[PDB]
Amino acid sequence: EDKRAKVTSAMQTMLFTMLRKLDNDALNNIINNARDGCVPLNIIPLTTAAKLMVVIPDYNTYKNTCDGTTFTYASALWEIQQVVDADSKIVQLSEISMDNSPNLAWPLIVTALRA
Amino acid sequence: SKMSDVKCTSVVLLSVLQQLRVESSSKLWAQCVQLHNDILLAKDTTEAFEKMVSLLSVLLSM
Amino acid sequence: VYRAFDIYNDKVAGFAKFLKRLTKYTMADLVYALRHFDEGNCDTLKEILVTYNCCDDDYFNKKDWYDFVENPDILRVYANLGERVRQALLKTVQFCDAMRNAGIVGVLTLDNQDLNGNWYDFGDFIQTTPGSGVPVVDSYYSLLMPILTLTRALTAESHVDTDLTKPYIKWDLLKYDFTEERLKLFDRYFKYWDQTYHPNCVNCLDDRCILHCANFNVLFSTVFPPTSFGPLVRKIFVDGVPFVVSTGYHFRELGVVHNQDVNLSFKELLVYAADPAMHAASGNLLLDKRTTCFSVAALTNNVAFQTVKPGNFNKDFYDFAVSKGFFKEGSSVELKHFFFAQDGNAAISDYDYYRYNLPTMCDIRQLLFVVEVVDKYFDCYDGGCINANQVIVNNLDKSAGFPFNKWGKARLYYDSMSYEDQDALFAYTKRNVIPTITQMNLKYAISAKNRARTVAGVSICSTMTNRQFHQKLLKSIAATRGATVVIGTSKFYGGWHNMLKTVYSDVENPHLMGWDYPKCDRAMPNMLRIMASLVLARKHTTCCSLSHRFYRLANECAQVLSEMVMCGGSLYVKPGGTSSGDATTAYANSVFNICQAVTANVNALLSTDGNKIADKYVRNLQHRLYECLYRNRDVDTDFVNEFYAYLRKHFSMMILSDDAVVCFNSTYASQGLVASIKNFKSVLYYQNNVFMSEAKCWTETDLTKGPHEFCSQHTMLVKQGDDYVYLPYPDPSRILGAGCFVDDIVKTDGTLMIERFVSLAIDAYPLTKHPNQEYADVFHLYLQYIRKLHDELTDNTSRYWEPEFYEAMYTPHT
RNA sequence: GGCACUGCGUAG
RNA sequence: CUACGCAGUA
Ligand SMILES: [Zn+2]
Ligand SMILES: [Zn+2]
């Protein structure tokens, strides 16, 4: 019984923790946009998420996708706020170059915020 | 046969490398893993010695 | 010259080759080339590809050009035919309409339409009242179907005005109900397919209707955007606070499935937590360029990379083996099984192998007859729904899946869930769909190849409900002896000999045959998994209604076929395949294997010339097979029984979920009345979308040698009690590698070591009977080493190193 | 830190 | 027959 009560409390707490992370500003708008009120799950982050993470395996993909400090994805304009390598060490935008590519620990995780 | 004990020494070398917290670095761990897998899958004794010497040099760097 | 014809008359019936503006080739030649595929004879396919600018001549000079796995670029080459095929479809419909306007009752065959799409034949046509003549297009469409998704004929439907040059259609991002578009797609292409088509499989009559409608939907789901498929969420209010909860699902094959208990309770807490809606809604967007797989969200602020450690080494055992003369230069017994280490990018690289799974549209009439025949292999077992108190769980100290692994193991959940709560959840799953999230974890085990292997731990809700649904049938299958499926049959105590004698049961000219499935867990089509689930669910005619069985199938599809993969800390969508951590992986795999074998047999018997068959009974069987396959709607139980008996007599199978040993009549296979390696290769090419190579398949002429390899064991005939019995032995390299390399250092010294080697000495005893001396010395090495461990650690235990303890393990006494 | 099956091992 | 640990197979 004690394990049951503790686990009930923990799962309720974790659901509430996800709830506090959820922003209704865009979710309400997209929900009211739909006539039925049901929307696919896979389009919730594509329209309501404020932070985007991109994993880059090679420099060619980096140049193709997010070469500059500001790029576009999912019909939205994103601005780069952080870049790190596979060791979770901060890598500057100037550090990423064709000459410096062998010195970088790929893949590169770039974190951007919606604009 | 030197192939077998070369493979065994390569296995223990990668184990002690992992115990030395080398897997924190992505590039060094990737190189060590590729060298160890190539040693294990190799069929040429001289190539196995060459790759094992490369791995041992990587270990001796730190 | 030799041309492919689909013939059906009073004498011969089948889709076979015969000696007999207008283009050189016809549509039947393309269908035959892509269905009966042999790399040795690929001419007709080569001129078909070259003539219509699908590729160049130099393309075929490349080795492994046909292989899907080795040369995925071929998927582009075939796609160049697709639009052409699409045009043919349109013309076909026009032709049908013309006949309907002329009062013509006729049968449309593939061999009368050239590759330009024109119909140049008008035979076998009888006048009727104008405006009433009905075409027969069952065989045409049924044979054409696999080529529709092999060549991706409907891709042109993804563009505005269905024009390749024009840009894509910008579908509404919020749109999820594509039913009207499915009606339009069925109306333009399959207009005269007279069987009723329900886009949402909720509205299906029975299992066969579900299979037919899902077969159509698999083709029709390629046009629609991939963001629309998945759980459908709704914003509800509980206790005065909003939640995002899934109130339905959108299967590519089953259409839109809405829940019935949508209300806006530890069971309800599990239903909420297992739902990916709450995890993906609050997660950050993800763009993972490492894979072409669609990504959903990143549940953490940092991506995690998991590495596989190198296996430990046993210097004691290796030194002992070297001191006894093992691992010597030029020895027949060497080390080839090692612990292979992997870097941090191994997990996502393994997950990227799901790109081999493709949308395959199976031949519907063939699949229906094949499922009817496969159901005969499972008529001896019994199955049904069981209560929560009758469910037996082997071990409760395993992972409970995501996100339930953050709080405890499965034991805690089974303890908290009262029997009434478990029954309530099980009854809930019969009315609603519960999407789940399954983790993929790198596995740490011996291998002879450096490719990493992953295991898909599933959530506790799916495990519980699937157990309550399927455990009776699973335990019935595992407890039956002398059947086709040999799951649960122990190889010890004469089990191997009994299994082999069962396989050799009264075959006129017996030869042994065996094959393997390349990328079986990654390349299995969704239709075959759906059919396997339906076969396993056919035992519930008396306990579950139609709606309950359909919703259980939808739950299995959502929690297995279209899972949410929690890979490396991020949510991806699984295109298909099977979960290695599923409840019914082995049994669904066995059903799929029997399906492939029966399909190969049907293809071999139908592709036979027929006129050259010297047996009246076999010719009549072939004619009845064709007329019950592409001309009979309802199930013909008499002919299903007859064909099942024919296969059981001339094609004896021993199946364990991937390993198949077939004892087949050599003469019948030689004449083409029974499947061979070529037939299985063709079937795998046009159904499983994988090229099967002759290196992974074996054939044995002398039964005394036995199967070359079954369950990674070789078979030999040995003397015991004046009796020649079949005895299985493993690879000595595998046993030596297991001895030398242990999983962790805890198993490098101590009492446990003894037990380990004892088990190994149990598995590698038969090598003493092997003619090769090193194999026989392996077991004596293990015995002497166990004796040395006894000496180091230190009368009951004295039995551990005497050979009689392992002698008794292979006698039929127990 | 996955499912199913078989076989051993120490305790009743 | 139950609990636990190990080994093999897919
Ligand atoms: Zn239907
Ligand atoms: Zn039932």
Residue numbers in the entry:
A (entry chain B): 77 to 191
B (entry chain C): 1 to 62
C (entry chain A): 31 to 50, 118 to 361, 367 to 896, 910 to 929
What wording appears in the published article?
Coronaviruses use an RNA-dependent RNA polymerase (RdRp) for the replication and transcription of their RNA genome. Biochemical assays show that the RdRp uses the active form of molnupiravir, β-d-N4-hydroxycytidine (NHC) triphosphate, as a substrate instead of cytidine triphosphate or uridine triphosphate.
To investigate this, we solved two structures of RdRp–RNA complexes that correspond to mutagenesis products after M-templated incorporation of either G or A. We formed RdRp–RNA complexes containing M in the template strand and either G or A at the 3′ end of the product strand. This was predicted to result in the formation of nascent M-G or M-A base pairs in position −1, which is occupied after successful M-templated nucleotide incorporation and RdRp translocation. We indeed obtained RdRp–RNA structures that contained either an M-A or an M-G base pair at position −1. The structures showed an overall resolution of 3.3 Å and 3.2 Å, respectively, with the active center region resolved at ~2.9 Å in both cases. As expected from the scaffold design, the structures showed the post-translocation state with a free NTP-binding site at position +1. The cryo-EM densities at the −1 position of the structures could readily be interpreted by modeling M-A or M-G base pairs. When we interpreted our cryo-EM densities, we assumed that one stable tautomer predominates in each case; that is, the amino-M tautomer forms a base pair with G and the imino-M tautomer forms a base pair with A. These base pairs do not impair RdRp progression, explaining the observed mutagenic pattern seen in in vivo studies of NHC-exposed coronaviruses.
